[PDB]
Amino acid sequence: VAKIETQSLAGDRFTSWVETYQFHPLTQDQKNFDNQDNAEFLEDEGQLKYELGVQLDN
Amino acid sequence: STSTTLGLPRWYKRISYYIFKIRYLQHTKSKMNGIPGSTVRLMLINRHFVEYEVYE
Amino acid sequence: VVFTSETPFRYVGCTGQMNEDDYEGHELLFFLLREGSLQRCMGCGQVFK
Amino acid sequence: YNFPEYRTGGVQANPGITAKRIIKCIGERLRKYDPARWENVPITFKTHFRDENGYSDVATSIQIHDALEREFGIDIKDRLALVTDVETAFYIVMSHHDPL
Amino acid sequence: RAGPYNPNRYKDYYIPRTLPKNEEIVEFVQSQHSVPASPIRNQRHINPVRESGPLPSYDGTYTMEDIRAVFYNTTVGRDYCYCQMDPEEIMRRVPGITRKEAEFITKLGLSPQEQVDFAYIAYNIGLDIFYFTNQMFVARQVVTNSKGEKVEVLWNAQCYEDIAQLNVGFAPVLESVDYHWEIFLWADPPIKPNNDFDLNVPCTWFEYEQEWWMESCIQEDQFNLPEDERPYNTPRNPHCRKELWRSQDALQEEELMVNENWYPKNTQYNIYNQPDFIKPK
Amino acid sequence: DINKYMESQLVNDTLRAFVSKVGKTEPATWKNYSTIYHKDNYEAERVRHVAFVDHKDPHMYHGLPQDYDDNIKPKH
Amino acid sequence: MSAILKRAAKYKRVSSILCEGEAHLRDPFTPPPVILKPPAPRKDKKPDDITDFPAQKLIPLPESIPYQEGKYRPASIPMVAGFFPYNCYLQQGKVYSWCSCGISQSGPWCDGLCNSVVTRCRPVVFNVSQSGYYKICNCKFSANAPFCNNTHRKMVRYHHQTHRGFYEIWGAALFVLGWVYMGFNYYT
Numbered sequence: 040v041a042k043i044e045t046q047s048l049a050g051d052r053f054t055s056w057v058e059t060y061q062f063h064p065l066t067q068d069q070k071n072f073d074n075q076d077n078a079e080f081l082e083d084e085g086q087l088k089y090e091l092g093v094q095l096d097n
Numbered sequence: 098s099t100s101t102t103l104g105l106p107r108w109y110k111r112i113s114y115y116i117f118k119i120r121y122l123q124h125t126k127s128k129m130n131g132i133p134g135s136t137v138r139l140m141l142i143n144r145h146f147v148e149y150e151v152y153e
Numbered sequence: 154v155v156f157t158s159e160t161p162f163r164y165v166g167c168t169g170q171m172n173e174d175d176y177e178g179h180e181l182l183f184f185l186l187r188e189g190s191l192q193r194c195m196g197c198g199q200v201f202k
Numbered sequence: 203y204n205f206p207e208y209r210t211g212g213v214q215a216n217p218g219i220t221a222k223r224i225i226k227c228i229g230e231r232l233r234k235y236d237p238a239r240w241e242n243v244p245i246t247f248k249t250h251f252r253d254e255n256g257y258s259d260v261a262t263s264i265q266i267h268d269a270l271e272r273e274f275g276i277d278i279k280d281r282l283a284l285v286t287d288v289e290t291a292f293y294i295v296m297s298h299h300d301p302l
Numbered sequence: 303r304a305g306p307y308n309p310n311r312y313k314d315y316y317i318p319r320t321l322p323k324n325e326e327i328v329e330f331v332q333s334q335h336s337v338p339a340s341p342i343r344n345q346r347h348i349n350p351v352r353e354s355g356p357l358p359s360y361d362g363t364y365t366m367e368d369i370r371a372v373f374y375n376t377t378v379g380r381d382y383c384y385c386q387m388d389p390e391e392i393m394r395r396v397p398g399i400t401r402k403e404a405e406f407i408t409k410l411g412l413s414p415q416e417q418v419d420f421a422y423i424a425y426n427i428g429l430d431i432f433y434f435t436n437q438m439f440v441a442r443q444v445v446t447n448s449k450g451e452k453v454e455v456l457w458n459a460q461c462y463e464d465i466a467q468l469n470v471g472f473a474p475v476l477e478s479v480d481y482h483w484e485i486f487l488w489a490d491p492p493i494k495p496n497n498d499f500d501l502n503v504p505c506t507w508f509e510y511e512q513e514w515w516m517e518s519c520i521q522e523d524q525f526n527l528p529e530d531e532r533p534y535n536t537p538r539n540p541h542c543r544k545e546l547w548r549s550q551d552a553l554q555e556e557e558l559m560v561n562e563n564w565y566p567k568n569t570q571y572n573i574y575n576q577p578d579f580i581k582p583k
Numbered sequence: 584d585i586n587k588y589m590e591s592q593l594v595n596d597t598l599r600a601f602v603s604k605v606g607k608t609e610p611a612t613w614k615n616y617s618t619i620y621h622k623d624n625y626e627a628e629r630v631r632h633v634a635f636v637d638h639k640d641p642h643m644y645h646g647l648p649q650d651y652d653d654n655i656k657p658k659h
Numbered sequence: 660m661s662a663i664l665k666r667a668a669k670y671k672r673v674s675s676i677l678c679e680g681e682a683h684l685r686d687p688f689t690p691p692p693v694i695l696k697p698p699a700p701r702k703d704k705k706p707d708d709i710t711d712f713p714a715q716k717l718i719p720l721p722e723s724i725p726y727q728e729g730k731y732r733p734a735s736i737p738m739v740a741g742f743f744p745y746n747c748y749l750q751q752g753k754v755y756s757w758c759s760c761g762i763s764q765s766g767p768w769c770d771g772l773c774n775s776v777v778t779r780c781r782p783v784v785f786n787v788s789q790s791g792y793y794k795i796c797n798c799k800f801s802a803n804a805p806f807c808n809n810t811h812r813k814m815v816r817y818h819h820q821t822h823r824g825f826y827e828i829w830g831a832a833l834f835v836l837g838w839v840y841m842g843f844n845y846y847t
């Protein structure tokens with residue numbers, strides 16, 4: 040399980056517990072799905088290489 | 098008739114909220130019996146059109 | 154203790170911990186106090202026998 | 203310099219000293235307010251401030267309330283209890299959560 | 303069909319049909335006044351205890367910040383929250399809870415925060431989580447009282463001011479199947495018990511939630527200054543310290559009062575008959 | 584009679600600890616006998632007695648059932 | 660898994676402390692963080708097994724907290740209950756309870772409503788060495804526990820910096836300017 044916290048522009052805060060298998064990475068352009076088990080959205084040091092898009096089935 | 102309050106008219110405490118939530122989820126699960134799951138329902142809805150002139 | 158003269162149950166209304174400023178604690182919640190065990194009002198926790 | 207104690211609730215921790223303070227302040231106030239009556243009477247813990255028939259005087263008790271308020275820095279609710287003896291004063295003082 | 307019935311046509315035995323002997327009357331009066339009588343109900347609260355278990359801690363496995371964070375994410379959907387908290391973690395947060403209770407709580411539809419909070423409440427108040435909510439009693443809770451009797455308490459199903467909306471049923475079901483033409487069948491009136499103020503007890507059934515909702519409706523639209531921006535280590539107030547202030551005269555007076563032979567010494571007359579009294583005037 | 588007062592305090596502290604340990608709870612009042620001067624019966628001002636200054640304070644658990652042993656012994 | 664393990668050697672972690680600091684540094688009653696390690700896993704799992712994790716120090720809720728001399732971090736987030744300090748006359752040597760939660764009906768003082776709300780904010784019982792007029796904090800955020808240290812100005816500025824607070828203040832300003840515009844155009 041992964042807990043995700045977001046916040047709206049009016050200060051409302053939303054919390055959602057989502058199973059790990061729901062996450063599917065998108066490509067850099069976010070046009071197409073990104074291949075799981077082989078995808079580099081983290082640089083060598085370990086930080087985000089770009090704004091990563093992830094799709095959740097539910 | 099079934100009361101919508103499930104016997105808990107007021108959530109004066111959060112334990113009342115928990116009891117109502119548990120009973121409400123069980124009640125809704127029992128109601129949604131004989132109604133297919135999301136995947137099967139979407140499969141039936143998307144593949145509804147079965148009228149094509151030419152097949153392979 | 155709520156008394157009944159040989160009847161299995163009685164309607165009981167609870168208004169919580171009554172105070173001097175307001176004569177009632179919470180809203181008048183009714184229930185059917187039955188015979189056999191202790192029973193309590195979940196709104197205020199008052200145990201009825 | 204004598205540093206005041208850090209631990210709070212010292213009034214409740216010394217019942218004897220609290221009773222001594224109550225006796226002292228009540229005695230001073232009663233001798234000032236009604237010298238013709240209380241200047242010869244020793245005031246101890248069992249001393250009451252009522253008539254021989256149990257009838258209480260409101261003026262004397264309100265004077266005692268003022269004395270206790272000034273001595274301990276408290277606000278005695280005059281409408282809830284009337285101090286007619288040293289025992290009642292002790293109960294009121296030890297019941298308050300901010301005496302000092 | 304059954305025939306007519308008149309219960310007054312049949313004898314009943316509530317009074318013995320023989321009269322007591324005179325000697326037996328005298329001996330019985332003597333005997334009953336030679337021993338204590340049975341006690342009569344006393345409604346004083348001797349040593350009240352918290353009805354909702356121990357009060358939440360400032361710091362520990364489970365504190366009040368957890369309760370607040372629970373409040374700010376309340377929702378009642380049509381589907382389960384299939385994200386299950388670890389039963390080991392639930393057991394760790396609430397040390398006394400057993401494995402079966404933690405697993406069953408994880409098998410309910412609560413979000414993990416609510417799962418841990420519900421585990422805390424259920425363990426502290428002795429709630430039975432396997433009790434299915436119906437229109438007779440919404441909950442069951444086994445608690446041992448001050449005499450160690452291990453009684454059970456059944457949280458009933460209630461109605462808001464309206465007996466007409468009350469489900470007067472005797473089945474473990476939610477439906478309203480029974481319809482009574484005569485609500486008070488035996489003419490016994492319902493009761494709204496009034497509580498004597500002198501015999502009240504301090505509120506301990508989740509007393510810390512009475513204003514909760516109100517406050518949480520005011521803090522949802524409130525922006526709080528981060529601790530990075532809140533000034534700290536500001537100069538102390540000149541006249542205030544962590545130790546409550548006592549004048550040196552008061553400290554000296556208490557030191558003098560420590561002595562056993564203390565007397566006011568400021569009286570005009572020797573009212574305490576002290577051998578070492580010097581008139582101050 | 585200061586001994587009367589101190590013995591009453593000690594007895595009621597022991598009774599509170601014993602009853603709290605029996606019931607797996609905490610005391611509700613910390614007032615030995617209920618009288619209406621504080622109005623704590625129907626107001627929100629408790630008579631709870633828990634005073635300490637930090638997490639290392641030895642007197643943190645005084646007044647709570649955690650202060651007593653399973654034999655209802657006053658210390659630890 | 661394998662792809663992650665290939666690059667896991669070079670990955671570097673970052674601290675989880677952000678915009679919150681350490682509670683034990685700015686607040687008593689909070690023991691310093693302790694790393695608890697689990698025991699060996701149980702050979703058999705029984706339905707009636709309670710936890711075997713090492714116990715954790717349990718600090719009860721204090722009835723009230725002392726005056727922390729200029730070093731006061733609220734135990735929980737309080738209700739602001741006003742951005743202006745009260746100017747209250749405090750008597751010398753009299754014990755005052757200051758409302759930390761902010762929901763008290765009795766002005767700056769505690770009353771009893773902190774026991775009726777889910778918060779760790781306990782009243783600050785303090786005593787002044789000299790009677791006089793003091794600026795009692797009413798925003799409940801001041802580092803001086805019962806006194807004002809002009810933190811409410813920072814709170815107001817932060818509220819104005821937020822998007823919703825900016826919109827609210829500009830909406831009120833435009834409402835007042837609409838009133839002023841009507842008063843200015845009243846003779847057209």
Ligand SMILES: CCCCCCCCCCCCCCCCCC(=O)OC[C@H](COP(=O)([O-])OCC(O)COP(=O)([O-])OC[C@@H](COC(=O)CCCCCCCCCCCCCCCCC)OC(=O)CCCCCCCCCCCCCCCCC)OC(=O)CCCCCCCCCCCCCCCCC
Nearest residue numbers: 047048049050051822823824825826827828829830831833
């Ligand atoms: C007077 C102020 C002046 C200074 C303004 C300064 C900036 C103010 C805004 C700052 C941010 C405040 C918070 C905003 C909402 C944030 C919450 C959120 O999630 O939002 C997403 C949310 C989506 O819903 P959600 O996320 O599912 O749920 C909301 C939250 O969960 C939960 O949220 P909630 O439920 O708590 O709140 C609900 C509330 C939330 O919304 C608000 O509070 C917004 C209140 C109004 C804001 C107005 C200022 C807009 C600021 C940007 C302007 C940029 C100008 C510069 C660039 C362009 C011009 C060159 O919903 C509404 O108010 C309902 C919609 C109201 C629409 C008003 C439309 C006005 C149009 C004016 C132009 C046309 C006039 C003629 C026609 C009139 C009829 C249409 O969006 C909204 O609710 C708001 C919708 C409207 C936003 C766009 C407004 C555009 C205005 C254009 C004006 C052009 C003027 C003419 C040109 C001038 C130059 C040439």
Ligand code: FES
Nearest residue numbers: 758759760769773
């Ligand atoms: S401390 Fe604020 S209401 Fe008591």
Ligand code: FES
Nearest residue numbers: 796797798807810
């Ligand atoms: S009101 Fe001024 S700092 Fe709090």
Ligand SMILES: [Zn+2]
Nearest residue numbers: 167169194197
């Ligand atoms: Zn009730």
